[PDB]
Structure 1
Amino acid sequence: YQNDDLRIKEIKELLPPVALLEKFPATENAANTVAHARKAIHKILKGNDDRLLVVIGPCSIHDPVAAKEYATRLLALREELKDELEIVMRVYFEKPRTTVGWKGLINDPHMDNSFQINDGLRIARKLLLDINDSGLPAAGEFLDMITPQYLADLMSWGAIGARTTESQVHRELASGLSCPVGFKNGTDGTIKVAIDAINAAGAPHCFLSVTKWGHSAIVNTSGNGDCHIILRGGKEPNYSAKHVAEVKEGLNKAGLPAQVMIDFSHANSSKQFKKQMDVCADVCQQIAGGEKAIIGVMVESHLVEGNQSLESGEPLAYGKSITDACIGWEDTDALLRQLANAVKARRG
C-alpha cells in the first residue's frame, strides 16, 4: 500500500497464545497455586487478612536453571513463613529500558540479538508453569497488551510499570486482568497518577486488544477491584511514615482504602541494592509499630548479590542479575524473616 511500512524492516510469524497454552497447560497443582494466591491477595486487599504480600525475586529472568534454584529456596521460606507472609516470586521476562541493551528473556532469550521471541515465549511459559506447579505463586509486569496473554493465567499478581501508570491502554488492560494489579507512583513521586489508574482500572472498558488466537478484537472488561498503589520513590524515597500518612489520606480522599505496597528498590533505595535492607528496617518498624496500611512490599533479589554486564562478553556468573543489582540469597533470607517478625509484632 502507499505511504506504508517505510520504517518497518521485517515482519515475522508469532505463535498465537493458544499454541503456548496448548503446549504448556496449567497442571492441576499450578492452577491451584494461581487460584489460591489470587484469593489470598484479594483477602488482604479487602482488609480480612493481616499478613503481608511479598513480591520478591530477580529484576528479571535470564537463566531458567538459576531461576528454578531460586524458586525452590523461596518456596521453602514461603512454607515456613506463610502465617505472616504471602510470598510471591517475581518472575519478570522483560526489563524496560530507555537506552539500547538486552530487553529480557522473551525478546531475546539467547542474549545475542537473535530475538528468538517464539523461543522466549516457550521458555518463559515453561518456567512460569514449572514454578507454579512446584507450589510457588508468580508475579509479573504488564508492559504491553500482547505479551500478557501468553502468561496471565499463571500470574497471581502483576504490576504496571511506573512509565505506563498514566497510559490509558495499560489502565484498560488492568481492568480485564484476572489477577490483582499494583500501580506505581510517578517517577517524580506523584501519587495522583496511581490513584487515577486504580479508579480507571476498577471501571469497565471497551477497547481494542488481541485474543488468544493472535487476532485483534474489540474487548469489553468488567473492571478490576483488586488494584492498589506501589510506593517506589520519586526524586527522594517515599517509604517512610510521613509519606505513608500522605498516601493513606490521599487514597481515602479519593474513596479508596488506605493501603500500600512499598517497593524497597528502584528510587526507594536510590538504585543501591543494599539500601533495600535499610528500607526494610524502617518498614518493619512501621509494621511492628502498628501500621496496618502496609499490605505488601517488593524486593529485587537473586541467588548472588549485585549485577554483571552482558556487554563485556565475559561468561555470565551463575545466579547473578544482568539488569538491576539485587540482594543475594543470605540478605534475602534475613529480609524475609525480618518482615515475618514485623507482621507477627503488628498482630500481638
Structure 2
Amino acid sequence: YQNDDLRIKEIKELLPPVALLEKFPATENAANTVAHARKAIHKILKGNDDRLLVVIGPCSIHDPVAAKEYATRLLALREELKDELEIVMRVYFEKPRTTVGWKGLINDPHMDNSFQINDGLRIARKLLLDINDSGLPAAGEFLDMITPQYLADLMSWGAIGARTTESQVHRELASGLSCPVGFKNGTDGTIKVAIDAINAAGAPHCFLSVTKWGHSAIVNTSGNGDCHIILRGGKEPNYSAKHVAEVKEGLNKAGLPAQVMIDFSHANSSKQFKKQMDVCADVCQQIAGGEKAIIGVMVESHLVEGNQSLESGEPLAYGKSITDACIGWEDTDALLRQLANAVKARRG
C-alpha cells in the first residue's frame, strides 16, 4: 500500500493469548489465590475490612529464580501477618521509561536487546502462575494495551502509572479489568487526574481492543468500581497527613470514598530507596493514630538492597534490582512488621 510502513522496520509473529493460557493454565490453587485476594481487596475498598493492602516487591522482575526466592520469603510473612495485612507481591514485567531503556522481562527477557517477546510472555506467565500457585497473590502495572490478555487472570491488583493516568485507553482498559486498579496521581503531584481516572474507569465503555485470539475487536466493558488513588509524590512528597487530608476532601467532593494507597517509593522517597523506611514511619504513625483512609501501601523491595547496571556488562548480582533501587530483605521484614503493628494499633 502507498504511504505505508516507512518507519516500520520489521513485523514478527506474536503468540496469541490463548496459546499462553493453554500452555500455562491456572491451577485450582492459583485460581483460588487470585479469587480470594481480589475479594479481600474489594472488602477493604468497601470499608468492610480494617486490614492494609500491601503491594511489595521488586521494581522489576528480571530473574525468575530470585523472584521465586523472594516470593517464598514474602509468603511466610503474608501468612504470619494476615490478620493485619493483605500482602500481594509486586510482579512487574513492564516498565515505563522517562525516555528510553530496558522495558522489562516481557519486552526483552534476555536483557540483550534481542526482544524475544514470545519467550518473555512464556517466562512471565509461568512465573506468575508459580507465584499464585504457591499461595501468594500478585500485582502488576498495566502499561501495554496488548500484554494484559496474557496475564490479567493471574493478577489480583493492578496499577496504571503516573504517566498514563490521563490516558483514555488506559482508563478504558481499567473499566474492563477483573481486578481492582490503582491510579497514581500525576507526575507533578496533581490529584485531579487520578480522581477523573477513577470516575472514568467506573463507567462502561466501548472501544477497540485485542481479544484472547490475538484479533482486534470492538469491546464493551461494564465499568470497574474497585478503583482507588495511589499517592506517589509530586515535586515534593505527598504522603503526610496534610496531603492525605487534602486528598480525602477531594475524593469526597467528587463523590468518592476517602481512601488512599500510599506509594513509599518514587517521588515520595525522592527516589532514595532507604527513605521508604522514613515514609513507613510516618504512615505507621498515621495508621496507629487512627487514620482509616490509608487502605494500602506500595513498597519497592528485593532480596538485596540497592541496584546495579545492566549496561556495564558485568555479571549481575543475584537478587538485586537492575532498575530502581529497592530496600533489601531485612528492611522489608522490619517494614512489614511495622505496618502490621500499626494496623493492630489502629484497631485496638
**What aligned pairs does 1:208-219 form with structure 2 within 5 A after superposition?**
208-219=208-219
State the Cα deviation string for residues 250-273 of structure 1 (Å, max 9, x = none): 000000000000000000000000
Dislocated runs of 4+, deviation >2 Å = 98-101
State the Cα deviation string for residues 320-344 of structure 1 (Å, max 9, x = none): 0000000000000000000000000
State the Cα deviation string for residues 99-123 of structure 1 (Å, max 9, x = none): 3321100000000111000000000
The structural deviation recorded for 1:98 is: 2.8
State the Cα deviation string for residues 152-210 of structure 1 (Å, max 9, x = none): 00000000011000000000000000000000000011000000000000000000000
Quote the Cα distance in structure 1 between the aligned partners of 2:162 and 2:7: 28
Which has the higher mean CA deviation after the structures are superposed, 91-100 or 47-56?
91-100
Quote the Cα distance in structure 2 between the aligned partners of 1:128 and 1:302: 17
State the Cα deviation string for residues 289-347 of structure 1 (Å, max 9, x = none): 00000000000000000000000000000000000000000000000000000000000
State the Cα deviation string for residues 212-268 of structure 1 (Å, max 9, x = none): 000000000000000000000000000000000000000000000000000000000
Quote the Cα distance in structure 1 between the aligned partners of 2:87 and 2:167: 29
Instruction: Calculate the TM-score normalised by the size of structure 1.
Output: 1.00
Quote the Cα distance in structure 1 between the aligned partners of 2:280 and 2:191: 21
The structural deviation recorded for 1:145 is: 1.4
**What aligned pairs does 1:1-348 form with structure 2 within 5 A after superposition?**
1-348=1-348
| CA RMSD between the two structures | 0.4
Does the residue aligned with 1:297 lie in a helix, a strand or coil?
A: strand
Quote the Cα distance in structure 2 between the aligned partners of 1:238 and 1:98: 21
State the Cα deviation string for residues 61-100 of structure 1 (Å, max 9, x = none): 0000000000000000000000000000000001111333
Does the residue aligned with 2:3 lie in a helix, a strand or coil?
A: coil
Quote the Cα distance in structure 2 between the aligned partners of 1:174 and 1:273: 29
Does the residue aligned with 1:73 lie in a helix, a strand or coil?
A: helix
Count, aligned residues: 348
Quote the Cα distance in structure 2 between the aligned partners of 1:104 and 1:276: 23
Does the residue aligned with 1:83 lie in a helix, a strand or coil?
A: coil
Does the residue aligned with 2:54 lie in a helix, a strand or coil?
A: strand
State the Cα deviation string for residues 267-286 of structure 1 (Å, max 9, x = none): 00000000000000000000
Quote the Cα distance in structure 2 between the aligned partners of 1:191 and 1:287: 21
Quote the Cα distance in structure 2 between the aligned partners of 1:252 and 1:94: 32
Gaps of 5+ in 2: none
Instruction: Calculate the TM-score normalised by the size of structure 2.
Output: 1.00
Does the residue aligned with 1:151 lie in a helix, a strand or coil?
A: helix
Quote the Cα distance in structure 1 between the aligned partners of 2:304 and 2:335: 15
Quote the Cα distance in structure 1 between the aligned partners of 2:145 and 2:153: 14
Quote the Cα distance in structure 2 between the aligned partners of 1:160 and 1:42: 18
Does the residue aligned with 2:229 lie in a helix, a strand or coil?
A: strand
Quote the Cα distance in structure 2 between the aligned partners of 1:169 and 1:99: 20
Quote the Cα distance in structure 2 between the aligned partners of 1:165 and 1:87: 24
Quote the Cα distance in structure 2 between the aligned partners of 1:259 and 1:98: 28
The structural deviation recorded for 1:151 is: 0.1
Quote the Cα distance in structure 2 between the aligned partners of 1:103 and 1:4: 27
Does the residue aligned with 1:124 lie in a helix, a strand or coil?
A: helix
Quote the Cα distance in structure 2 between the aligned partners of 1:223 and 1:313: 46
Quote the Cα distance in structure 2 between the aligned partners of 1:173 and 1:99: 23
Quote the Cα distance in structure 2 between the aligned partners of 1:83 and 1:89: 17
The structural deviation recorded for 1:144 is: 1.9
Gaps of 5+ in 1: none
